[PDB]
Each structure stands twice: as C-alpha cells, then as structure tokens.
C-alpha cells in the first residue's frame, strides 16, 4: 500500500521540531511505498502526489505530583509551502490544573490533505511553559500517520 506512521522520540516539552522513530522494526512504526524519513531535517518525505488522510495523536503525562499546568500544541508544516506560515494540521491539548487525579491529556486530529511529489512534512511542538518539567510526552503515543486515499 501507500502509508506511514511515525512515533515521536521526544519526551520533554521543548519548543522546536519533533524527531521521529522511522525504523519499521519498531512497534507502532510503518513506512511503505514511496515514503521516507529525512533524519537530519526531521521530515517525512512523500514520493507520489495525491490526497492523503493525515492524522496526529498527542498524549501527555503528569510526571511531578501536584504540579504543572498550561497548554501544548502540535503544528504540521509543509515544505515547499503548498502561502505564508501555513499550518496544514494543528492540535492543542490543555494540561489540567495541578486537583483530583487528572494526570493525562489526549488529543487527536485528522483531515484529508493534498500532497505534492517530494512534499516534506514536519511537526513543530509548542508549549505554554508553566513548569514544563512537571509534564512530559507519553512515549509511544505521540504519533503522526497517513495513508493514501487517491487510487
């Protein structure tokens, strides 16, 4: 087929681009057909042009008790810019206040995107820092995926 799924390496909440596990021996990871990962630029590279369902998942875990609040965002950016500062897919998850047993936070978003040949997909993580040491990415749960819909 024509699909891919990547699992984020990052655990700490640092403003900047996410790195991705891209080896299909890893669980939760797939690359098939004309899809590949540039380790240097941290980009998912699409070989054949078409319409894809693209989704990303974001899960956070409280790691210091009774501490940490704020907001965390993911933003998918295309390259080449298929306008200015175009965010093809964007997800914000609110971190509940420091309370009775709300130690996790989930986000899922999906849509159909038209993607060109050689289109590069990268994901920027932004965090509204409020004790960003008290929260961390849940490992094996921040996922970027896509599969081709166009036959």
Partner 1 sequence: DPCSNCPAGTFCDNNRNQICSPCPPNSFSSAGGQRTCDICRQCKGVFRTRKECSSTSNAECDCTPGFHCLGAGCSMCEQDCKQGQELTKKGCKDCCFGTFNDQKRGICRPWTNSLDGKSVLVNGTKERDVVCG
**Smallest distance from Na ion to CB 23, Å:** 4
Among residues 98, 128, 131, 132, which is the contact residue for its own copies, using CB under 8 A? 128
Q: Is 12 in the site for partner 1 (CB under 8 A)?
A: yes
Which conformational region is residue 88 in: left (phi greater than 0), alpha (psi within -120 to 50 degrees), or beta?
A: alpha
Task: Give bridge partners of residue 72 from the DSSP assignment.
Answer: 93, 127
Rg (CA), the chain: 16
Range in contact with its own copies (rule: CB under 8 A) among 9-17, 36-44, 116-124, 139-147: 139-147
Find which of Na ion, Cl ion, its own copies, none residue 36 binds, CB within 5 to 8 Å per kind: none
Calpha distance 88→134 (Å, rounded): 29
Find which of its own copies, Cl ion, partner 1, none residue 102 binds, CB within 5 to 8 Å per kind: its own copies
Q: Which of positions 28-47 make contact with its own copies (CB under 8 A)?
A: 28, 30, 32
Q: Is 107 in the site for its own copies (CB under 8 A)?
A: yes
Among residues 26, 47, 87, 112, which is the contact residue for partner 1, using CB under 8 A? 26
CA 121 to chain centre: 10
Q: Please, is 57 exposed, middle or buried when counting C-beta atoms within 10 Å of its C-beta (0-12, 13-18, 19+)?
A: buried
Total residues found in the chain within this entry: 151
Range in contact with its own copies (rule: CB under 8 A) among 12-20, 40-48, 80-88, 119-127: 80-88
């Amino acid at each position: 087929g024509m699909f891919a799924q990547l699992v984020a390496q990052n655990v700490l909440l640092i403003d900047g681009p996410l790195s991705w596990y891209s080896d299909p021996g890893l669980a939760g990871v797939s690359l098939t057909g004309g899809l590949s990962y540039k380790e240097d630029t941290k980009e998912l590279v699409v070989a054949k042009a078409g319409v894809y369902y693209v989704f990303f998942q974001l899960e956070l875990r409280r790691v210091v008790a009774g501490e940490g609040s704020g907001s965390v965002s993911l933003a998918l950016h295309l390259q080449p810019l298929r306008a200015a500062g175009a965010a093809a897919l964007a997800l914000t998850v609110d971190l509940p206040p420091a309370s009775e047993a709300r130690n996790s936070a989930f986000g899922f978003q999906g849509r159909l995107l038209h993607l060109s040949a050689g289109q590069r997909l990268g994901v920027h993580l932004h965090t509204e820092a409020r004790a960003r040491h008290a929260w961390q990415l849940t490992q094996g749960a921040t996922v970027l995926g896509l599969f081709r819909v166009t036959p």
